[PDB]
């Protein structure tokens, strides 16, 4: 379950982005929204799991960087502070997804937009669930790449391209 | 009013207003593969999550039902007297 | 009122088909095929890394101390 909170927003992003043609605007909206709704429900449970019972959860998958004295894993720790952050992150992400069906209805590129939304949720989960500072940096940079992708969503407007340079480089 | 766009441009994300008429069938198929993929990562979690404190017997903790470390504990604790 | 999906993948118009330029044969069968065959072989490659060797000795030194429990 714990490693499934991490995985679901990522899969919905990949379907909406690389397979938007097959699912269409409706199918992309449904898969993107449903995956983050499911993740939100699994995260409310994990708050009862970890915080209310004082049971931290550790899961390591494989090593990322292996050297002398340097062993950084693709590992995740769930503690009281992790589940505390996950609730606003996933409640707001779920609702903004549902909101965005009405707000971005007339826009031509909905699959690309909803893909960037799920990509941001995945990266924000990586930032708060990591075992180490270097995997937290992956979410930090990832959220930055996703904010550049979403500030500059309308690439035709030059103002947007200046403001995304500001976000990326600052 | 919809923007005029070129119809020879191929995009993996669909392009300008792309919804296929098979959208529902394809979306159903992508849902199953998502469900199948997320089923494998779940079984990985169950066998590889690590806890240093087990939950209370009567205290709400739905992980009790699928994680092996807890299931090994609760079955062992169900042997006494 | 969503539009039909459109576009020409590889620039092939809806009439004709993709014409094989020549590179495709070796690159799909030889270049990529070699990498999958290399990938499946790499699974059965024995592990001759320094760490797998150094971990096992390191455990036998810390087992000689209270730091690591010994199965004996």
């Amino acid at each position: 379950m714990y490693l499934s909170i991490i995985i679901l927003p990522l899969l919905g992003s990949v379907v909406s982005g690389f397979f938007g043609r097959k699912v269409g605007v409706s199918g992309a909206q449904l898969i993107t929204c449903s995956s983050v709704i499911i993740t939100t429900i699994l995260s409310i449970i994990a708050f009862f799991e970890v915080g209310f019972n004082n049971i931290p959860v550790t899961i390591n998958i494989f090593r990322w960087i292996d050297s002398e004295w340097f062993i950084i894993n693709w590992g995740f720790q769930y503690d009281s502070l992790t589940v505390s952050m996950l609730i606003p992150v996933l409640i707001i992400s779920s609702l903004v997804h549902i909101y965005s069906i009405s707000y971005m209805s007339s826009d031509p590129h909905n699959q690309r937009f909803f893909s960037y939304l799920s990509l941001f949720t995945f990266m924000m989960i990586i930032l708060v669930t990591a075992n180490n500072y270097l995997l937290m940096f992956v979410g930090w940079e990832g959220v930055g790449v996703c904010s550049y992708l979403l500030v500059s969503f309308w690439f035709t407007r030059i103002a947007a391209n200046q403001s995304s340079i500001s976000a990326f480089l600052t | 009013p919809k923007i005029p766009y070129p119809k020879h441009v191929w995009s993996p994300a669909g392009g300008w207003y792309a919804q296929p008429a098979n959208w529902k069938q394809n979306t159903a198929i992508f849902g199953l593969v998502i469900f199948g993929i997320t089923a494998m990562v779940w079984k990985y979690s169950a066998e590889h999550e690590v806890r240093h404190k087990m939950p209370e017997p009567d205290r709400f903790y739905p992980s009790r039902y699928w994680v092996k470390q807890i299931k090994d504990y609760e079955r062992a604790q169900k042997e006494k007297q | 009122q969503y539009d039909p999906p459109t576009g020409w993948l590889w620039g092939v118009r809806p009439g004709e088909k993709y014409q094989n330029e020549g590179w495709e044969g070796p690159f799909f069968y030889g270049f990529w095929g070699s990498l999958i065959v290399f990938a499946i072989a790499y699974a059965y490659k024995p592990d001759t890394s320094i760490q797998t060797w150094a971990l096992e000795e390191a455990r036998r030194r810390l087992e000689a101390e209270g730091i690591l429990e010994d199965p004996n």
Binding site: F18, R21, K22 | P20, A21, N22, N26, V33 | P4
Partner: peptide, 19 residues
């Protein structure tokens, strides 16, 4: 409404089969 249908694609199967 239109009837143009999009097939799942070869990229769909190479990714699924690859996984």
């Amino acid at each position: 409404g239109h009837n143009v249908e999009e097939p799942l694609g070869a990229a769909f199967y190479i990714a699924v089969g690859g996984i």
